[PDB]
Amino acid sequence: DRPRFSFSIAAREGKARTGTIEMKRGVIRTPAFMPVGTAATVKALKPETVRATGADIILGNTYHLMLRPGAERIAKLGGLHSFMGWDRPILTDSGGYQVMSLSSLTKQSEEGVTFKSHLDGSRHMLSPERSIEIQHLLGSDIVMAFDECTPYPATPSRAASSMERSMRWAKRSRDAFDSRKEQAENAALFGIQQGSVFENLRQQSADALAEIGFDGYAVGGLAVGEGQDEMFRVLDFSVPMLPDDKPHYLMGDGKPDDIVGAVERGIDMFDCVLPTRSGRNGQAFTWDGPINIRNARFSEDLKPLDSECHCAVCQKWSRAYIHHLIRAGEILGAMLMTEHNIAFYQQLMQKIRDSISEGRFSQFAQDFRARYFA
């Protein structure tokens, strides 16, 4: 019934857009938050719970999956969707970022990268061709081109070199994806803009990616230490360089205010790990800003994590109980914190979508920030 891929914009306000991506496995409402699944699980949540929070799509980490349980093994078992029990779209990253951040003994070349697993020191390889193949074996719906990441800060020369290599690799990724009929006909492929903080390099990258042609365009290389002011400054000039009629995906971690500002700058998709990572460490998001539930001030607080949140956690349990669970190291604490935090991010996305649709997003952003930072 549904097409391989169709992005439609229903409403706009300034640079912000709201709409839908239709794919074979489901519809994705945009702007979208895509919860992160590492090794075939969204931390401490059954897939049905992830869906109940409002997620339309989740991310799978290729690097983690190729190490454990293995890409070929997942294919033999019927693919990632079947394996983990999530039947809606899955976006897979290329594996490259985690190779840089997590792996050891990395050897980089124009062909790709060889590296040692951080788990057992076994040797592995990634390349544009192999990354696209692994994403095929997983049965990914949205496949990411394999690129070479640029650390922050980067000199103009190094940023240019890595961007140029990334563009050559974007073409190789495109060709690998297209040559595999089943993948080409059923999945989508996104390209990744590079260029660090440099406007000229960002423009060259956008031009190269548009010439190749992709179903969507990510902004890569941000959220890696430059800070919000600089990230926003780069997004100001970078997002307008990308094709307007395709989704714009900001890759990287983000707080609620990062998401709001990025949407104001034309971003349609987010993959923030913060709500799945920081939940078990005690951080809970609320409309009045984040709290750390471990703080002693919550030990006898009968209110829910957030006073307005519609999630199941906030309907049933108190701050006092969750404080106890997290302090005690109980698994249920991680379950409840993670469900609430992902649900909070999804409610943020719903408010963003509704406000853009109603032409009051700028007001929403101002009201959101005033209260969140009060």
Added chain:
Amino acid sequence: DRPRFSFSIAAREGKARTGTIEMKRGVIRTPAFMPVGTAATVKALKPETVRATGADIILGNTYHLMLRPGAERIAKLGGLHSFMGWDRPILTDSGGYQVMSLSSLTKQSEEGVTFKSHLDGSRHMLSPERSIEIQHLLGSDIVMAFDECTPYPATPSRAASSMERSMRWAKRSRDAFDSRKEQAENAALFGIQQGSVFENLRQQSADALAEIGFDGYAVGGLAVGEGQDEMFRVLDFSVPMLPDDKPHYLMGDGKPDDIVGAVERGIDMFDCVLPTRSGRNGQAFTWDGPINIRNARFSEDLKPLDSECHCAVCQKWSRAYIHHLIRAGEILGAMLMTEHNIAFYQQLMQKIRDSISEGRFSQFAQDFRARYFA
């Protein structure tokens, strides 16, 4: 509507019985498996999931709760049921066993015991009066008398001394419970038979407890190293000493075959920790015996944990997936293993209840053992 406490026996076969305990917060089907909640949580499960597995009642560990978050704190917050979100009956243990097993610097006397917390070395006290008070503060439905445990093996003299002290403490527990109107009118009190492996001491203990009078009678002091043959030998003579018309509660850990044999000997209630403890360590129960899901033989096994199990885990996920989760140390692995194992124990209890009701329990026990140990 329902009474404070009413135990009714609907059917019998040999020493085995099936029936119901009616209490204000709900009906408990017997023979019953009562999943263990330590510090106000059944490991890795929301209360609704615990209920979905078939549990009618759960256990709360008094020792753990008095340390964290504290009994007075739980009372201030509205009681244990409200705190953790379980609205059905809760049985609380007295705290005594864990004082012996887990605490340090224990000082025992005829008055009670003082001890240091294993968490932070803070000093605490338990006595018949204080244990009953803590169970009141938690809002327990079934309160356990506070006793003095007897290690295995025990000399006849030491077993007699501890049994005699336990009987004096049973009277003190009875009086403390009765003097508190709200507790006496709404909760039930069980006494605990002691006497180690000695028939004469078990008889003296049963006589003392029956003279005092309780709503139910536990068999204490077993499942502590004597092994199944000896446990069954002691149950053979010990259970018939207890009043026939009240529930018989075996305190201690147990495998599926321990439960079946104990029911054959007249036990009505079980509190086995094994399914909540061993799940995250890899052990899954099946009708063909236990398996360890971490074993490499399961890495590509698409079958559910058990071929007949009706639990949600066995409807949705494969052995291969759960193998991966447990090997990877993922929280979802513990969630799924624990849900399946508790559900397996509940299905065992349902088959036991149905077979007794139908006068075919002896056949069920034989068939169960033949297959479980094949």
